[PDB]
Write a protein that binds this ligand. Structure first.
Ligand code: CA
Ligand code: CA
Ligand code: CA
Ligand code: CA
Lengths: 90, 90
């Protein structure tokens, strides 16, 4: 049996694979692949930053692709943002 | 509605708050609360580390509690391990 946390992580990992398996190195997500991922699996408050800005931000070693570890940065930033949005006033 | 990623992140945040709700500040999980979470929401490979070990490792600002941001360290670890497992063979 898998815990709730395991299921959530698996779904996150499933999302990455859906894009890394598109072309080229199947363990990497390229610029256009990421743009698709952002406008399809991410909320407005995250999308509106720009797919190119996000790519520049996620491609740490600047090899032209986003691998899993780098993708996890986006996942963490999204969690932090989601959490902050839940108890933020105006 | 919600995307697959939003759902996954909400589920992760909800699991943390399920235990942070027990006592004290809603934004804090105490050492005993963490032990309960680990034994219930985490797989054997995470638990075997020891509840006291996880608490000290996660309490980054040493305030005696584990906040959401700190909890993400555990989540990342699980993701990396889950990712590695999905690419494995029989
Ligand atoms: Ca690829
Ligand atoms: Ca890279
Ligand atoms: Ca609490
Ligand atoms: Ca702390």
């Amino acid at each position: 049996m898998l815990t709730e946390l395991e299921k959530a992580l698996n779904s996150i990992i499933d999302v990455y694979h859906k894009y890394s398996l598109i072309k080229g190195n199947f363990h990497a997500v390229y610029r256009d692949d990421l743009k698709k991922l952002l406008e399809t699996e991410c909320p407005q408050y995250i999308r509106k930053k720009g797919a190119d800005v996000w790519f520049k931000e996620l491609d740490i070693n600047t090899d032209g692709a986003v691998n899993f570890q780098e993708f996890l940065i986006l996942v963490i930033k999204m969690g932090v943002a989601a959490h902050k949005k839940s108890h933020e006033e105006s």
